[PDB]
Amino acid sequence: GIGKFLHXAKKFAKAFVAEIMN
Amino acid sequence: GIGKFLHXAKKFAKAFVAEIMN
Amino acid sequence: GIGKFLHXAKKFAKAFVAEIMN
Amino acid sequence: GIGKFLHXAKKFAKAFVAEIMN
Known part of the structure; x- marks a missing residue:
């Protein structure tokens, strides 16, 4: 899907943002 | 962490790949 | 009707999403 | 492209106008 x-x-x-923060 | x-x-x-193959 | x-x-x-990515 | x-x-x-105008 396009939604998916x-x-x-x-x-x-x-996940990217969570990780650059750690 | 890394794994996640x-x-x-x-x-x-x-998902990027499935989307281009439609 | 609804389906169409x-x-x-x-x-x-x-088309919108394609256009913004190109 | 832009045309598409x-x-x-x-x-x-x-489709919207035809739907909503009933």
């Missing part, structure tokens, strides 16, 4: 794909990016965006 | 973060990357990678 | 209208909407959403 | 996307918008607008 974008709600994919959002998860990775958030 | 790569396993974020992995899901985005695989 | 929603599937109008879905085509715009897909 | 614009002619996405047009189909959506036509």
Whole structure:
């Protein structure tokens, strides 16, 4: 899905942000 | 941590790929 | 009806997202 | 392209107007 794909990016965006913070 | 973060990357990678193959 | 209208909407959403990525 | 996307918008607008005008 296109929804799946974008709600994919959002998860990775958030994991990225959590991690640069650590 | 890393595992969780790569396993974020992995899901985005695989969803990005499924999306381009439609 | 609804099915045809929603599937109008879905085509715009897909074209919109494509357009912003290109 | 822009042509494709614009002619996405047009189909959506036509589907919306036709839906909502009952």
